[model samples]
Target chain A: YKIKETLKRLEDSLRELRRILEELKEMLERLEKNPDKDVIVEVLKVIVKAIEASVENQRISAENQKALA
Target chain B: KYKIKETLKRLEDSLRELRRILEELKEMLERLEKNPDKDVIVEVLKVIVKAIEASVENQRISAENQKALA
Candidate 1:
C-alpha cells in the first residue's frame, strides 16, 4: 500500500496540541497554588512524545523510500 | 484588590485569545496535512544532529540556573 498516512498522523499531532491548550488554560487558573512542576511535566511529556514520533516517522519514511526505490 | 483582579482578568483574556489562535493554527495544519514548500527530513536529521548540542547545552544551563539563580 502507498504511504498516505504520513500526513494523517501529523494531523493527529495538531489536534493533540490543542487538547493540551485546554489544560494549559486550567493550569493558568491554578497558578496561585505555588505550582512548580505541573506545566513543565506536561510540556516535557509532549516534547518527549514529539521526539520519539520523529524517529518513528523517519524510520517508516526511510523504509518507504527504499521500498519505492 | 483591583490589581490582582486586573491581572487575573488579563490572564483569562490572553488565554482565550491564545486558544482562538490555536484553532486557527490547527485548522491551518489540517489543511497542510492534506499537502508545503516542504523543506525535508533526511536532511532534517542533520539539523537535529546540530540541534542536539543546543538542547544539551540548554539543559545544562537550565539545571545550573535552578541551582544558582532560582
Candidate 2:
C-alpha cells in the first residue's frame, strides 16, 4: 500500500495526462494544416514533458514494487 | 461461419494473453516497489519488455489484419 501509493497516484495522473496528450496531438495535427505560432509547439513540449516525467515516475514505482513484493 | 469463429477464437486468446501480461506487469511492479532489489528490478524489466513485445505482436494480427493472414 505504501509503495503503490505512488503507483495509484501515477495511474490517476495518467488519466488526466492521457486527455492532455490527446488534445496536444490533435492540436499538433491542426497546426500541421495551418502553420502555428510558438504557442502550439510550446504546449506540445509541455505535454510531452509531463507525460515522460509521469511515465518515469511510474517506472520507478514499478521497480520499487518489484523490490518489495 | 466456421472460419469466422476460428478467427474470433484467435482474437479472444490473444486478448486473454494480453490481459495476463498486463496482470503480470502490475504484480511485478508491486513486488519490486516493496523490495527494491537490483536483480529483481532487472528481472521485472525483462518481463516488462516481453509483455510489450507481446502487445505489439497482438496488434500485428488483429481483425483489421485478417486479410493479410488469409
Candidate 3:
C-alpha cells in the first residue's frame, strides 16, 4: 500500500514537471520571431534538453510501475 | 553585441552534465526492483530535481539574453 501510494505521488510530480516543460516550450515558440539566429538556436537546444528530461522521467515512472508489479 | 556563443557553450556543457546524471539515475532506477533502498532513491530524485532546476535556470538566462539582444 505504501509503495503504491508513493508511486502515485511521484507520478503526479512528474506530470507537473511535464506541464512546466510544455509551458517553457510554448514560451520559446512565441519568442522565436526575435530575429536572432544564435539565441534561437540556443533556446531550441534548451527545449530539446527539456524534452529529453521529460522522456527520462517517463522512463523512471514506467520502471517504478514495472518493479511494483 | 553579446557573448551569445560563450553562453551557448556554457549551456551545452551544463546540459551534458545533466545528461550524465540522468543516465546514471536511469540505471539506478532500472535495478530498483532488486534493491529498493528508499534513501538511495530519494537521493537520486534530489539529483534529478537539481539538474532540472539548473536547466530551467539556464533557459531563463538564455531567454533574458535573447530579449536583451533584441
Candidate 4:
C-alpha cells in the first residue's frame, strides 16, 4: 500500500511538471514565430528558469523514494 | 539534407507537444487531488500516452546527431 501510494504521488508530480513545460513551450513558439528580440530574451529567461525549477522539483521527488536493497 | 531538416522540424514540433502534455498532466493531478475522478484520470492516461510518444521522439532525436544539429 505504501509503495503504491508513493508511486501515485510521483505520477501526479510528473503530470504537473509536464503542464508547466507546456506553458513554456507555447511561449517559446510565440517567440519563434514572430522574432522579437526583447520579448524573446525575456521569454527565454523564463523558460530557463522554469526548466531549472522543474529539475529541482524532480530531484526532490527522487529523494522522497529510497531504493530497497 | 532536407530530410534531416524536416526531421529536426518534426522533432521541434514534438517537443512543443511534449511541453503541453506535461502541463495537462499537472492540471489533471491538481483536479484529482481536489476531488477524485477515476473517469477523468483515465482520460489523463490517454494524454500521458501522447506524452510518452513525444518523449520517445525526443529521445530518438537526442540519441542521433543532436549536438551536431545544435
Candidate 5:
C-alpha cells in the first residue's frame, strides 16, 4: 500500500506539530510577562508554519493517490 | 479567564491522548493489513467514528478557547 508510506510520514508530521505546539505554549508564557509584540507575533506565525507543513504533507499524499487513480 | 489553565491542560492532555491513539492506529493498521475476520474492521471502524466525534467536540472547544485568547 503506497498509503503505508504516507502513514509513516504521519509520525514526523505530528512530531513537527507537537514541537511547534509545546514550544508555542512556552513562548506565550514568556510573552505574557514582558508582552513583546514582535516575539508574540512571530510565534503566531510559527504555528502557521507547522500547519502548513502538515497540510503540505497531506497534499502531497493526496496528489500521489489521485495520480494513481 | 482564570480557568484557562485547566482548560488548556485538558487540550494538552488531549494532545497526548491523540498521539497514543495514532500510534496504536498505525500498529492496528499494520496488523489489520490482511484479510481478517469480516466483523473486525466493520465494528471497530465505527468505534473510531465515535471517537472522532469526541475529537470534533474538542476542536469546537479549541476554537472557543482561541477566541478567549484573542
Candidate 6:
C-alpha cells in the first residue's frame, strides 16, 4: 500500500514533468526556425533524442504493465 | 543538410505525442489506484516511478544542453 501511495505521488509528479517537457519542446521549436544557428539546432537535436528516449522508456513501461495483467 | 532540420521536426512531433501518451497513462493510473487491480498494480507502480525518474533525468539534461547551446 505504501508503494501504491508513492506511485500515486509519482504519477502526479510525472504529469507536471510532461508539461514542462512540452513547454521546452515548444521553445526549442521556435529557436529551430533560425536558419543561421546550426549550433542551436544541434543542441535541439540532442534534446529531442533525449526526449524520444524518455518516450521509449514510457512505452516499455506500458508494455511491462500490460504483460503483468 | 536539410535532413537534420527535417529530423528535428519529426522528433518534435514524436515528443509531443509521447508527452500526450504519458498524460493519459498518468490519468489511468490515477483512476486505478483507488481500487488498484492487484494483478498489475505492482508492475504499474514500478513503471510509473521509472517514468518519473526518466522525466527528471531528461529535464536536467535539457536544461544543461540549453545552457551549453546558449
The Cα local distance difference test for each model comes to 0.40, 0.54, 0.56, 0.56, 0.51, 0.48
lDDT of 6 by residue, A13-69 (tens): 445556655655554455445423464444345455546655654554444334334
Q: Mind sharing the TM-score for model 1?
A: 0.29
For model 1, residues A1-69, the per-residue Cα lDDT tens digits are: 333443344334434533444444444334334434564354345445545644454454444444444
Model 1, residue B7: what's the lDDT?
51
The C-alpha stretches of model 4 lying farther than 4 A from their native spots are A1-69, B61-70
Q: Roughly what TM-score does model 2 have, to 2 decimal places?
A: 0.43
* DockQ agreement of candidate 2 with the native complex: 0.02
| Model 4 C-alpha lDDT per residue in residues B1-70, reported as the tens digit of each score | 6767877787788788888889988888788687765445444544554565466446445323232332
Q: Which ten residues in a row have the lowest lDDT in candidate 1 chain B?
A: B61-70
Q: How many residue pairs clash in each candidate?
A: 0, 16, 0, 8, 0, 0
Cα lDDT, model 5, residue B21: 66
Better structure of 3 and 6 per DockQ: 6
Best of the two (2, 6) by DockQ: 6
lDDT of 6 by residue, B1-70 (tens): 3554555555466566557657866876876668756424433433444454455555433333222322
**RMSD versus native structure for model 3:** 20.3
What is the per-candidate TM-score for chain B?
0.50, 0.74, 0.70, 0.67, 0.70, 0.53
Q: What is the lDDT of residue A4 in candidate 4?
A: 48
Pull out the clashing pairs in model 3. Answer: none
DockQ of 4: 0.02
A1-69, model 2: which lDDT tens digit per residue? 544454455445445444554555554455545553564455446555545644654464454445345
Off by over 4 Å in 2: A1-69, B63-70
When only chain A is evaluated, what TM-score does every model earn? 0.49, 0.53, 0.56, 0.61, 0.64, 0.47
Off by over 4 Å in 6: A1-69, B40-70
